[PDB]
Design a protein around this ligand. Structure first.
Ligand SMILES: [Mg+2]
Ligand SMILES: [Mg+2]
Ligand SMILES: [Mg+2]
Ligand SMILES: [Mg+2]
Ligand SMILES: [Mg+2]
Ligand SMILES: [Mg+2]
Ligand SMILES: [Mg+2]
Ligand SMILES: [Mg+2]
Ligand SMILES: [Mg+2]
Ligand SMILES: [Mg+2]
Ligand SMILES: [Mg+2]
Ligand SMILES: [Mg+2]
Ligand SMILES: [Mg+2]
Ligand SMILES: [Mg+2]
Ligand SMILES: [Mg+2]
Lengths: 244, 216, 16, 345, 130
RNA sequence: AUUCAUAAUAACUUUUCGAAUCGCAUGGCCUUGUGCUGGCGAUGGUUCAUUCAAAUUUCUGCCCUAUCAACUUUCGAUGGUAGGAUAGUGGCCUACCAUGGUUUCAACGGGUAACGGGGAAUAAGGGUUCGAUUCCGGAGAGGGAGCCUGAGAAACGGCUACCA
RNA sequence: GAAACUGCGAAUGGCUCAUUAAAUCAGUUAUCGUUUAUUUGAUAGUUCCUUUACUACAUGGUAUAACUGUGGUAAUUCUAGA
């Protein structure tokens, strides 16, 4: 092509969305945003094909511009806004709060949470660097730049972010024995505990994870997301607790 | 050939058809922006001075300034030029244009009356055309009426009366760049926001420093 | 922490 | 500001400012002709609306409210027996001022009064005080819907308690003086409509006591609130006046001309006359005109000459002479005044 | 006799309405008109007829039963606000807008883009020319 | 893994940026002044990160032909240095240098009714054939060449020349 | 609220397989080798420094369209002068 594409064929859309192949010819193309295209759920899909509150695109537009939907504690009006993993969606009129977490099948599951849980989210530390004026900052998996991080917070760690103000309440190191969640690959959506981080210079690191059933599997480090210490997750987990 | 004369000071303009070739003789070989004496053109123009502004040829192609030829040529015209209006942004078009040298191929020649002669032309100097619109910016209004700074432009806005049927009212422009309480509000709010941001950043830096001191 | 607990009924009319 | 949105765009959806909605809003529940759920009842008004609201509104507060009182609202005898607990719960949840739950709660409060009206009287004082705090709280967070819900609940209570409140109409206004005298114009405007319904339902005798009290009060924004109160009571439909309009003017006119009343009261009458005169046509004003002219002639005297002259000057100025049926009566009135004062007037 | 049955009822305060599936049992009858069904749903839900919408009704093979989808808005104004234009036209709540065929509109749009500006000056120019 | 991030010193610049923008609404202080202060939004703006993208790029894999055995290098072919150019690496181009680079493990040349793939058909299995054609990627807009605009085009339902 | 200026888009979509035999393409790598509108999150008090002889209660045409009016051409989404 000669420039960015603006259309997405239904057969080319991510499989986990569950879009009927015969319903139409095109699927919602996620706009630019915090999460990548393939790992995101546009709000139209969530409101129409998952919650069934809206019957087609147009009532979804109506709902959004009514400002009844809040993502990340902020009102969003773009139908194709790319909501993604660990994003908090609030519908105050219905008094409903959702956290986007994959099921064991690998599909974003409608997981209802309390307001107290909705007050905070988790972000994997993708980068830690000194910015201008010598101010350290951390970039999380959702593109949030948080300045003046705790200097122990390192790459691959996870930080608890307050939605209202966007500061780091607490953090978890990436160590053996911590509780992790798989965000990619065939093991997607599984929950377990670390056993070893196998390290390859100049190559992709590999992590061995043991589930509650004692089964062990290996996944690339990029697909691992720490969510707590064993037996004490910092977020409510979906039904099944990431087993199988 | 035809002369389209304009008296800009009046804003007036009129066309004179020409038959005798001698005034065209005095017209030949001249260029856009040069001046000619009306008395050579005719007694009716005795004492007048005409500046050549442009013209259109027998085929209707216009004259262009900057090209010193007596014949037509195809020029690649771009944005912000005479004789071309780009339909699309960045569009450049090759179009035929007549040269700036007056010749026998010119159908109509546009003239500007630089100076008035002895006799008064019936259609130009005798008649006047008012300005279509008045000042809209506040400073333009002040310049137009020479208003002092203390005096307000609000009372001196030019107003035009419109009568529809038996109903009648007046219309005025919306003054722009007008100093109003809202603009003061916005400026003050901007300054307050800047100072608040600075204070918040200082507090954040101090808190980070205290954290570092606690650990060390 | 525990997830939030889960939470219109059909109505019938006969005529003619 | 100068021009309202007189010409409507083809847009199906158009932005509306909070002030714009408030200006268009009018408190007149009788005017709304939509089907009301409580019109159909099997056990009680409260239960009928309560079941409906349980499904629609899903706010956290209302759900907690519904769970607490679900058992005690099944039958009307149950409601009457547990009336005290029901009212306390309603007031407590309304006090939270949660806009997502106000609409069902406020409606249920009105329907609560409907089911037990004479018994609600002991609850009347607290109910009004709660609404006043709600409306005062409503000013902070702008929501035209909240005001609409609140004042309609106030209007509904008056409708159900019309007979009792009318007997002590002065008492009802005494509760709502802060609303009628509030700094905001619309709050005074909305309340005045609510009271006016009680006013047009008032007997002439009980009306006379009421007008004297407010007339005494006039002796901040109370003047403006009363003007809206009376004028709305007069106006019923476009280019027409209410049937009881004549009685109210006769009562108002007598007290204004009475010397005990303050001079400010006559000004209020002058303002009242202007509003109705502009609003109404020739024909609907004729019964009003006749009762005024008759009373001026009857009550003419030295002590009240100046007041009569003031109101008469209001009549002649009002829309020039277009609304005046017959000028000859005014001329006759004038020469009686001159024969029987303030030169400037 | 005709039986009307509502199932899978979901409250949608986002659209301020009630969404549900309509089952119509109509023995010895071809089917029931959308109008009559709107009457009966309005009576059942204690809401205005104007606030009730019904569509997508299919008679099951062999007759005697129909299944479709139904909406009950909280009040009529919201229905006017949220309904599609065509359904409002079906219910008469809105008047059908009269427009030319797509080809005529497009041809007029082409003719309009050809002319630059108001065109009155072009009209007077052609008038004086001829 | 770094001349990384960042910071510091000295100068420099036809040299930038640091809100002369807009809607709704009228709250709070008083020394009572059209005094001071003040809310909810839109649109702009430096730098960083993220996202959508783009460009190059590491390794392995293509049908027939040896009656195509040597090819590339004069007019860049292989590599070194310096410069120009570009968003940027790089013989991409320029100046000076060396004589290099591929090949019977088929280079080079020729043919291809050659867009490639996910796939389709057949078959017991190995295999054989098809795949313009609902999805991804590449190229094109009668055939060459060159460009304005714009973040993004060598665009053609944009432009200029030449051929038909 | 026509028209016009301004901003954005028109570089997506749709069509076809001409050219192309390590080229495209599939899988797999790198950018510590570079551009990136838009989305999203952060991010900028520099007090002072001679002519203060001082606009910030807010600077200019160093300017024009639409528009008024005078015109050319057989003709075009042609346009000249004022
Ligand atoms: Mg790496
Ligand atoms: Mg433009
Ligand atoms: Mg180099
Ligand atoms: Mg060379
Ligand atoms: Mg071919
Ligand atoms: Mg193919
Ligand atoms: Mg192309
Ligand atoms: Mg062809
Ligand atoms: Mg081309
Ligand atoms: Mg195209
Ligand atoms: Mg070949
Ligand atoms: Mg290769
Ligand atoms: Mg954009
Ligand atoms: Mg930004
Ligand atoms: Mg001009």
């Amino acid at each position: 092509a000669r420039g960015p594409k603006k259309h997405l064929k239904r057969l080319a859309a991510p499989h986990h969305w569950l879009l009927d192949k015969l319903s139409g010819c095109y699927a919602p193309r996620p706009s630019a945003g915090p999460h990548k295209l393939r790992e995101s759920l546009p709000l139209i899909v969530f409101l129409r094909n998952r919650l069934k509150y809206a019957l087609n695109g147009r009532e979804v537009k109506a709902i959004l511009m009514q400002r009844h939907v809040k993502v990340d504690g902020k009102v969003r009006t773009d139908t194709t806004y790319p909501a993604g993993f660990m994003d908090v969606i609030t519908l105050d009129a219905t008094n409903e709060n959702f956290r986007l977490v994959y099921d064991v099948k690998g599909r974003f599951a409608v997981h209802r949470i309390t307001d107290e849980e909705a007050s905070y989210k988790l972000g994997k530390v993708k980068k830690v660097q000194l910015g201008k004026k010598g101010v350290p900052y951390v970039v999380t998996h959702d593109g949030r730049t948080i300045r003046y991080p705790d200097p122990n917070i390192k790459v691959n760690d996870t930080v608890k972010i307050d939605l209202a103000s966007g500061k780091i309440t607490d953090f978890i190191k990436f160590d053996a024995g911590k509780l992790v969640y798989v965000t990619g690959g065939r093991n997607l959506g599984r929950i377990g505990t670390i056993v070893h981080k196998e390290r390859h210079d100049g190559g992709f690191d590999l992590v061995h994870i043991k589930d509650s059933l004692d089964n062990t599997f290996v996944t690339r480090l990029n697909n691992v997301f720490v969510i707590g210490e064993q037996g004490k997750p910092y977020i409510s987990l979906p039904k099944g607790k990431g087993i199988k | 050939m035809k002369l389209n004369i304009s008296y800009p000071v009046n804003g007036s303009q009129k066309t004179f058809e020409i038959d005798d070739e001698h005034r065209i003789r005095v017209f030949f070989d001249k260029r856009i922006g040069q001046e000619v004496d009306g008395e050579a053109v005719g007694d009716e123009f005795k004492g007048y001075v005409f500046k050549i502004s442009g013209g259109n040829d027998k085929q209707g192609f216009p004259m262009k300034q900057g090209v010193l030829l007596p014949t037509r040529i195809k020029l690649l015209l771009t944005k912000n030029v005479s004789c071309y209006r780009p339909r699309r942004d960045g569009e450049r078009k090759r179009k035929s244009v007549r040269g700036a040298i007056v010749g026998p191929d010119l159908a109509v020649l546009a003239l500007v009356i630089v100076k008035k002669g002895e006799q008064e032309l019936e259609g130009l100097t005798d008649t006047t055309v008012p300005k279509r619109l008045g000042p809209k910016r506040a400073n333009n209004i002040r310049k137009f009426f020479g208003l002092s700074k203390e005096d307000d432009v609000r009372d001196f806005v030019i107003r035009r009366e419109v009568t529809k049927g038996e109903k009648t009212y007046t219309k005025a422009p919306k003054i722009q760049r007008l100093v109003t309480p809202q603009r003061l509000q916005r400026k003050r709010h901007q300054r307050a926001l800047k100072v608040r941001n600075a204070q918040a950043q200082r507090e954040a830096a101090a808190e980070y420093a205290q954290l570092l001191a606690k650990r060390l | 922490p525990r997830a939030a607990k889960k939470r219109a009924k059909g109505k019938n009319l006969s005529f003619k | 500001a100068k021009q309202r949105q007189t010409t409507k765009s083809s847009k199906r959806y158009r932005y509306s400012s909070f002030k714009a909605r408030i200006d268009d809003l009018k408190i007149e529940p009788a005017r709304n002709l939509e089907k009301r759920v409580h019109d159909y009842v099997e056990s009680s008004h409260f239960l009928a609306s309560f079941d409906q609201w349980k499904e629609i509104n899903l706010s956290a507060k209302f759900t907690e409210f519904a769970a607490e009182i679900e058992h005690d609202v099944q039958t009307l005898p149950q409601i009457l027996y547990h009336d005290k607990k029901i009212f306390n719960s309603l007031v407590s949840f309304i006090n939270f001022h949660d806009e997502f739950s106000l609409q069902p709660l406020l409606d249920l409060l009105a329907q609560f009064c409907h089911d037990l009206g004479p018994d609600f009287l002991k609850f009347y004082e607290e109910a009004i005080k709660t609404l006043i705090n709600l409306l005062d709280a409503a000013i902070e967070f702008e929501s035209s819907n909240v005001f609409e819900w609140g004042f309609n609940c106030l209007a509904y209570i008056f409708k159900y308690l019309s007979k009792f409140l009318v007997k002590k109409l002065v008492l009802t206004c005494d509760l709502l003086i802060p609303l009628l005298s509030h700094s905001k114009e619309y709050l005074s405007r909305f309340s005045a409509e609510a009271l006016s319904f009680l006013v047009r339902k008032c007997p002439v005798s009980n009306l006379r006591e009421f007008v004297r009290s407010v007339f005494e009060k006039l002796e901040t924004n109370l003047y403006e609130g009363l003007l809206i109160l009376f004028t709305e009571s007069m106006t019923s439909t476009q280019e027409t006046l209410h049937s009881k309009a004549k009685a109210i003017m006769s009562v108002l006119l007598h007290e204004a001309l009475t010397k005990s009343s303050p001079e400010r009261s006559v000004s209020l009458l002058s303002d009242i006359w202007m509003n109705i005169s502009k609003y109404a046509s020739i024909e609907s004003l004729l019964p009003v005109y006749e009762v005024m002219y008759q009373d001026f002639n009857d009550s003419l005297d030295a002590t009240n000459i100046d007041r009569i002259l003031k109101v008469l000057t209001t009549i002649v100025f009002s829309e020039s002479g277009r609304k005046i049926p017959d000028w000859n009566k005014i001329t006759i009135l004038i020469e009686r005044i001159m024969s029987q004062l303030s030169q400037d007037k | 006799a005709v039986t009307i049955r509502t199932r899978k009822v979901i409250s949608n305060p986002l659209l301020a309405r009630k969404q549900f599936v309509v089952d119509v049992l109509h023995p010895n009858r071809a089917n029931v008109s959308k109008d009559e069904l709107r009457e009966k749903l309005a009576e059942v839900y204690k809401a205005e007829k104007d606030a009730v919408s019904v569509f997508g009704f299919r008679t099951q093979f062999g007759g005697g039963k129909s299944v479709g989808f139904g909406l009950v808005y909280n009040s009529v104004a919201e229905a006017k606000k949220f309904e599609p234009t065509y359904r409002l036209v079906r219910y008469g709540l809105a008047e059908k807008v009269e427009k030319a065929s797509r080809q005529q509109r497009k041809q007029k749009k082409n003719r309009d883009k050809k002319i630059f500006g108001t065109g009155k000056r072009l009209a007077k120019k052609v008038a004086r020319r001829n």
